[PDB]
Design an enzyme around this catalytic site. Structure first.
Site, PDB file in Angstrom:
ATOM      1  N   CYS A 297       0.792  -1.237   0.000  1.00 27.30           N
ATOM      2  CA  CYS A 297       0.000   0.000   0.000  1.00 27.30           C
ATOM      3  C   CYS A 297       0.826   1.289   0.000  1.00 27.30           C
ATOM      4  O   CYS A 297       1.600   1.535   0.926  1.00 27.30           O
ATOM      5  CB  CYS A 297      -0.949   0.020   1.205  1.00 27.30           C
ATOM      6  SG  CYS A 297      -2.096   1.430   1.181  1.00 27.30           S
TER       7      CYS A 297
ATOM      8  N   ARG B  18      -0.232   4.595   2.856  1.00 31.10           N
ATOM      9  CA  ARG B  18      -0.169   4.387   4.293  1.00 31.10           C
ATOM     10  C   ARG B  18       0.084   5.592   5.181  1.00 31.10           C
ATOM     11  O   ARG B  18      -0.039   5.491   6.401  1.00 31.10           O
ATOM     12  CB  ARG B  18       0.855   3.306   4.607  1.00 31.10           C
ATOM     13  CG  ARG B  18       0.304   1.914   4.435  1.00 31.10           C
ATOM     14  CD  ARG B  18       1.379   0.900   4.691  1.00 31.10           C
ATOM     15  NE  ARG B  18       2.300   0.770   3.572  1.00 31.10           N
ATOM     16  CZ  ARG B  18       3.454   0.125   3.643  1.00 31.10           C
ATOM     17  NH1 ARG B  18       3.829  -0.437   4.786  1.00 31.10           N
ATOM     18  NH2 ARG B  18       4.216   0.015   2.571  1.00 31.10           N
TER      19      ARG B  18
ATOM     20  N   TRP C 197      -9.306   6.114  -1.002  1.00 31.44           N
ATOM     21  CA  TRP C 197      -9.609   6.838  -2.224  1.00 31.44           C
ATOM     22  C   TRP C 197      -8.617   6.458  -3.323  1.00 31.44           C
ATOM     23  O   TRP C 197      -7.543   5.918  -3.061  1.00 31.44           O
ATOM     24  CB  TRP C 197      -9.658   8.355  -1.987  1.00 31.44           C
ATOM     25  CG  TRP C 197      -8.452   8.949  -1.399  1.00 31.44           C
ATOM     26  CD1 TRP C 197      -7.284   9.251  -2.041  1.00 31.44           C
ATOM     27  CD2 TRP C 197      -8.268   9.308  -0.032  1.00 31.44           C
ATOM     28  NE1 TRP C 197      -6.377   9.778  -1.151  1.00 31.44           N
ATOM     29  CE2 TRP C 197      -6.956   9.823   0.091  1.00 31.44           C
ATOM     30  CE3 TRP C 197      -9.080   9.244   1.104  1.00 31.44           C
ATOM     31  CZ2 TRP C 197      -6.440  10.271   1.310  1.00 31.44           C
ATOM     32  CZ3 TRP C 197      -8.566   9.690   2.319  1.00 31.44           C
ATOM     33  CH2 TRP C 197      -7.259  10.196   2.412  1.00 31.44           C
TER      34      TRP C 197
ATOM     35  N   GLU D  83      -4.609   3.944 -11.047  1.00 31.17           N
ATOM     36  CA  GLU D  83      -5.357   2.724 -10.818  1.00 31.17           C
ATOM     37  C   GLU D  83      -6.459   2.614 -11.867  1.00 31.17           C
ATOM     38  O   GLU D  83      -6.703   1.539 -12.411  1.00 31.17           O
ATOM     39  CB  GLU D  83      -5.976   2.720  -9.418  1.00 31.17           C
ATOM     40  CG  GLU D  83      -4.981   2.751  -8.255  1.00 31.17           C
ATOM     41  CD  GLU D  83      -5.662   2.427  -6.930  1.00 31.17           C
ATOM     42  OE1 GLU D  83      -5.665   3.261  -5.992  1.00 31.17           O
ATOM     43  OE2 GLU D  83      -6.211   1.319  -6.843  1.00 31.17           O
TER      44      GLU D  83
END
Ligand code: HEM
Ligand code: HEM
Ligand code: H4B
Ligand code: H4B
Ligand code: 3AR
Ligand code: 3AR
Ligand code: ZN
Lengths: 420, 420
Positions: free
Chosen positions: A119, A122, A291, A296
């Site tokens: 991730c 973070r 979000w 992506e």
């Protein structure tokens, strides 16, 4: 390093010393002879179909966690600490499991996120909203919880991080599972004419829904229904309230023709198929949301060959030289498609972050973690964006990857297992 | 896999079974607890300053190699095989080293390339031209060999892969080293006004040359002189013949103003600071060359912050919205800068490959290697291009990384060690 490993940033020459890796016991999948860093799901802990932990193997894990939880509140070895250990201890021997206090659950969830090596977002980890749905017992109750979560997290476009935690798994009483891979996603339908309508990554799931009676609109961007399984019973179909599903029509700030591409996407990414592990306890249903990072959608969701794969069409409309890859027509349409995505979300005032800002804050987050936690497990393969890699700071950052707990793990698809 | 590891391509669903990793003994730097796959130079074999192998540790290595060399020509265990082993054996005990026959050297070089896990252009591995410079004894002789190599490999723009191998290292007689990081590179000069003229990555080396009397033109794209060290003696300066250094003025196929940026680059990439290891023998001077993949120049060389870092200027000239990273002005100038590079080289008819074709042929190469060799060691972190990652096929390809020999290794800079 002799005992203390170091990671260097080759663009800035900054060096960091990692000691945090010393408290990792879970395996990475690599050995001193082979590196499996680019393997998607090394079954080191990809969660087995294989039953549930036993009273014996459950207490050590329960203890490791509590020791950690109290150490964080600098109360290691306290009477409270020791009292809680015996509590759980006895509680496990008697009921074969144990219950986390609200505080331990919140700490566990936040840390599963804090420990998620893949991730890049973070830096936000300690600002997660936890919704305790451990009292839920049915699919309708699950639907209600999920609806309240979607509404909360969306916050009319000013997205807020959250996670809803349903009952942990138990020997046989049964599993709560959200069959959807994400709370909000578009259906995929195969067409004998070879083509695929909608998102190709959701075809086998869309089939299940239809088998369960879902009245598929057979469209392109059809928001799928929720398929909720509670207490191991068969899953049930539910339609998330449209007014609750925020979407963004994709248009370009220069190319007025972009609109006509008919591109749209939802604003709330909400992973609902992972497993949360805290003190040996397994929460098979723990949907969480944050979000979107622009790439992506614009790079992976829209341009992945096996996804919407819109590169040609977009390229044609731009009248690029698609006769030679050397013209870099793919790269060019790619940059525009992502400029559109970011522009669109920002216009509708929907929270979104570009890969330049996201990777920038992750480097800051890393420095914060090495300064306050002795390190930060990071997966370079996943942290670096799928486009413009080397112009973002994470490409130049050496990262150490190791597994810490609490954590989010992958788990078998429920249909490839669920009975009747 | 239980004993047979598998790598999957997630875009095509193709799976490959790797058995080749079983013959790797060198360490990767990872453990079952930590993954160091994104670390630049794990000192697992980054070549120590520490002397030279001994007669004892040298024969096992010499044997491992010969066994492999003959096994490749399906002559394992032959009289020839056994005769050569004893030859070397005795040869090592007597002279403390041994000499490779021309055939073994060619096989070793090709395989060091075939085993280079970070190289995306390995489909060409067996078409390498080896130049045997083991009879060289001076810096002038080294200069001659290098000049003949540059001329050969450049081939008037139709680049040909080659490597020139100088005398292997020995206890004390001494080392042959090419102090330059690459045969052809541009100098870098620091300017008190904070800025840096030329390539920032070559400043400390340019200083050495100047200290040695090089008459630096104090320009932007100044081709550095060769600093050659033979038989451990001090290095000497040599100017590669200009007519031998092919360069390409960078211009754009649309933006006539691009020309005015004053961008230029050399067409022959030639790494000269690595170490070639074959049968325990170490060749500290083994310059080799192939041809450029566009991104190496347009993305890393031109846009790396710590390099030429031309993104702003290029962005200004395009009149992009540089007030917000969210406009993706960096990504856009980046695509154009690389379209120019590929266009420029192709116009001048100079061999160059774009990241789309290079990664495409590497996937084909991988499939060829898993079919004929049981696998292919690949470093995902290095194989995926620094721009447009996910639109190239290697991004979606799982790769196993392990170390095989013969190989190319990193070695300490000669000046950070060389005496007087
Ligand atoms: C605040 C917004 C956030 C952003 C910008 C963000 C961004 C990302 C990105 C870009 C990925 C890559 C996913 C992919 O490529 O499929 C990722 C993965 C992940 N994130 Fe975050 N994240 C955020 C919040 C969260 C939250 C709230 C949690 C959990 C509490 C979380 C847990 C994870 C996990 C477990 C993965 C790994 C997924 C996998 O390996 O399949 N993230 N995140
Ligand atoms: C035919 C043209 C070739 C192409 C297109 C090619 C391309 C590449 C690329 C893109 C890299 C990344 C380098 C970087 O980012 O700094 C690389 C690395 C490498 N290549 Fe190749 N290569 C070719 C030929 C060769 C040859 C002839 C050899 C050796 C005989 C070789 C050995 C290696 C090695 C050792 C590395 C790793 C460098 C490092 O880790 O620092 N390559 N190659
Ligand atoms: C094979 C390889 O591991 C795979 O394609 C990875 C690479 N990096 C990734 N990074 C992110 N963020 N998401 C992904 O799905 C992937 N896919
Ligand atoms: C930190 C990280 O390992 C480093 O920036 C790597 C990433 N991938 C790379 N890939 C190639 N081809 N060349 C490089 O120099 C790098 N740098
Ligand atoms: C679940 C909160 C974090 N989500 C996130 N930003 N990325 C991962 C999930 C989104 C998914 N990759 C998609 O593009 O559809
Ligand atoms: C040495 C032959 C292979 N070379 C190559 N294609 N890439 C690596 C060397 C070039 C170096 N990275 C540069 O951009 O200046
Ligand atoms: Zn590894």
């Amino acid at each position: 390093g002799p005992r203390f490993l170091k990671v260097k940033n080759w663009e800035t020459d900054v060096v960091l010393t990692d000691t945090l890796h010393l408290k990792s016991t879970l395996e990475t999948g690599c050995t001193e002879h082979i590196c499996m860093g680019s393997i998607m799901l090394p079954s080191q802990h990809t969660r087995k179909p294989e039953d549930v932990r036993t009273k014996d193997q459950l207490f050590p894990l329960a203890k490791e966690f509590l020791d950690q939880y109290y150490s964080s509140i600098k109360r290691f070895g306290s009477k409270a600490h020791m009292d809680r250990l015996e509590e759980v201890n006895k509680e496990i021997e008697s009921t074969s499991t144990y219950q986390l206090k609200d505080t331990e659950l919140i700490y566990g969830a936040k840390h599963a996120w804090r420990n998620a090596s893949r991730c890049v977002g973070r830096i936000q980890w300690s600002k997660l909203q936890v919704f305790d749905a451990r009292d839920c017992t049915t699919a309708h109750g699950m639907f209600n919880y999920i609806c309240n979560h979607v509404k909360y997290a969306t916050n009319k476009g000013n997205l807020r991080s959250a996670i809803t935690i349903f009952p942990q798994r138990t020997d046989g009483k049964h599993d709560f599972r959200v069959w959807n891979s994400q709370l909000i996603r578009y259906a995929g339908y195969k067409q004998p004419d070879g083509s695929t309508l909608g998102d190709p990554a959701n075809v086998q799931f869309t089939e299940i829904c239809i088998q369960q009676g879902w009245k598929a609109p057979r469209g392109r961007f059809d928001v799928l229904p929720l398929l909720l399984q509670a207490n191991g019973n068969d899953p049930e179909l539910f339609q998330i309230p449209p007014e609750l599903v925020l979407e963004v029509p994709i248009r370009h700030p220069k190319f007025d023709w972009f609109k006509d591409l008919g591109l749209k996407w939802y604003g709330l990414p909400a992973v609902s198929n992972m497993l949360l592990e805290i003190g040996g306890l397994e929460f098979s249903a723990c949907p969480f949301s944050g979000w979107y990072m622009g790439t992506e959608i614009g790079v992976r969701d829209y341009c992945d060959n096996s996804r919407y794969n819109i590169l040609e069409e977009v390229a044609k409309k731009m009248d690029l030289d698609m006769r030679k890859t050397s013209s870099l027509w793919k790269d060019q349409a790619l940059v525009e498609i992502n400029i559109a995505v970011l522009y669109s979300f920002q216009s509708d005032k929907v929270t979104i972050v570009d890969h330049h800002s996201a990777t920038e804050s992750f480097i800051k987050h890393m420095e914060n973690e090495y300064r306050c936690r002795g390190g930060c497990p990071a997966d370079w393969v996943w942290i670096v964006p799928p486009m413009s890699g080397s112009i973002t700071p994470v490409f130049h950052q050496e990262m150490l990857n190791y597994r810490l707990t609490p954590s989010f793990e992958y788990q078998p698809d429920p249909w490839n297992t669920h009975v009747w």
